[PDB]
């Protein structure tokens, strides 16, 4: 306060801010690869869903939508990228 660095602010206080009031705005959602070991391949899923995403071959499930991040379905794995 009174004198500080607006240009190079701490990673953490930037971290806790709203996604629109960061120094340069960016998302804070992500994508994942999801499995349900009946199948061998992996659909790519967005962290926020709206659409209850179905798998490639089997009419199984995967996740349900919510207010924000999707609730992933029961027996599943996930990596992030």
């Amino acid at each position: 306060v009174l004198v500080q660095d607006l240009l190079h602010p701490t990673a953490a206080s930037e971290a806790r801010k709203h996604k629109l009031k960061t120094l340069v705005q960016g998302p804070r959602s992500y994508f994942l690869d999801v499995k349900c070991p009946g199948c061998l391949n992996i659909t790519t899923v967005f962290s926020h869903a709206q659409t209850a995403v179905t798998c490639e071959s089997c009419s199984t499930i995967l996740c349900t939508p919510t207010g924000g991040k999707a609730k992933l379905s029961e027996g599943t794995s996930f990596r992030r990228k």
């Binding site: 306060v1 009174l2 004198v3 500080q4 660095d5 190079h8 602010p9 701490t10 206080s13």
Partner: protein
């Protein structure tokens, strides 16, 4: 504030905040001049020999006196850690 031919006219060139560089005018009887003493080899405070800073009443009024002091002294050489330019 010179004149026609050189010649320093108009008296009293005032002090100045080391925090804000605003003028520290006369009736600002709320400002302060802090003398920090110069030390030597093993303690010993060398009487009459200071590093000094002047802080406008406004600044101390706003509470910014202890943060702005930190910054001044630290980056002048008499603190290390304590202060952080970023937040």
């Amino acid at each position: 504030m010179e004149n026609d031919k050189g010649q320093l006219v108009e008296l009293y060139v005032p002090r100045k905040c080391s925090a804000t560089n605003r003028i520290i005018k006369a009736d600002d009887h709320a400002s302060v001049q802090i003398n920090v003493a110069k030390v030597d080899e093993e303690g010993r405070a060398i009487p009459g020999e200071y590093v000094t800073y002047a802080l406008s009443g406004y600044v101390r009024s706003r509470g910014e006196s202890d943060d702005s002091l930190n910054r001044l002294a630290q980056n002048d050489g008499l603190l290390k850690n304590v202060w952080s330019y970023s937040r």
